[PDB]
């Protein structure tokens, strides 16, 4: 497995004596290798993204279920409180209505 990322110092001299037919063959071989690496990188990125999805989703579903339960209870008892506010508001509303209807009488 030769590391293509490290440019070998001296490879430019070899290209000076390369014939046109050999240059085309080398260019075709390099293009095929580059496309193979790109597709492998594309496959690796898709696999890594999917795995990073699943590991994140593995925590996500259970944690979200717990969160849904806990704040469901919390803002259930919160919604309990606002009923008393409705009761009081309607109490003064009906008192004011009774007072004003009496004035119209």
């Amino acid at each position: 497995m030769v590391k293509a990322g490290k440019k070998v110092k001296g490879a430019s001299k070899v290209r000076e004596n390369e014939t046109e037919e050999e240059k085309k063959i080398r260019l075709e071989m390099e293009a095929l290798a580059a496309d193979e690496a790109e597709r492998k990188a594309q496959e690796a990125a898709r696999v890594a993204l999917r795995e990073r999805q699943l590991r994140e989703q593995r925590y996500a579903h259970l944690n979200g279920i717990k969160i849904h339960n806990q704040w469901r209870k919390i803002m259930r008892m919160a919604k309990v409180e606002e009923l008393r506010r409705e009761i009081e508001i309607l109490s003064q509303n009906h008192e004011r209505e009774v007072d004003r209807k009496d004035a119209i009488m």
Binding site: H61, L62, I65, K66, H68, N69, M77
Partner: protein, 163 residues
């Protein structure tokens, strides 16, 4: 008890807790035996009335009408071992599929639900026909009916992963 509950995964425990707390509106940690069957069905199970009454007698021995979360969990551990499979449901449908053509008439299936077995109410059958005969052609494809009743019940994440 602990041996039965050890078969439960933490995700299953959380799902059962959510289903219990949905009808545990007062937050006391118990649900009524009448809402007990509703909580049974919220998890994908399909208990009959006779089975519900039998398990109410089994667990709700004190007769207070309420069954708490640990008893809920042991009941789950007992009954998920015998969850009805889609193959069994399709085998049930092919009994009424007289012609074996893959579809059962809407009126015939309505009569089956309103006359044979645990009688379904007329409004329940109306909803059944509306959600099965989506195109309104008067024919119910029981295979797709089995598929969509099983959908939303048995771990749709598993179906997502099995692609």
């Amino acid at each position: 008890m602990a041996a039965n509950t050890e078969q439960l995964t933490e995700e299953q425990i959380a799902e059962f807790k959510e289903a219990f707390a949905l009808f545990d509106k007062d937050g006391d940690g118990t649900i009524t035996t009448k809402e007990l069957g509703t909580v049974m069905r919220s998890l994908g199970q399909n208990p009959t009335e006779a089975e519900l009454q039998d398990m109410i007698s089994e667990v709700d021995a004190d007769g207070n009408g309420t069954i708490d979360f640990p008893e809920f969990l042991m009941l789950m551990a007992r009954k998920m071992k015998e969850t009805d499979h889609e193959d069994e449901l399709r085998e049930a449908f092919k009994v009424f599929d007289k012609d074996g053509n893959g579809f059962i008439s809407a009126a015939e299936l309505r009569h089956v639900m309103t006359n044979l077995g645990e009688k379904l109410s007329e409004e329940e059958v109306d909803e059944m026909i509306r959600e099965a005969d989506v195109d309104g052609d008067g024919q119910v494809n029981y295979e797709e009916f089995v598929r969509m009743m099983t959908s939303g019940a048995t771990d749709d994440k598993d179906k997502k992963g099995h692609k």
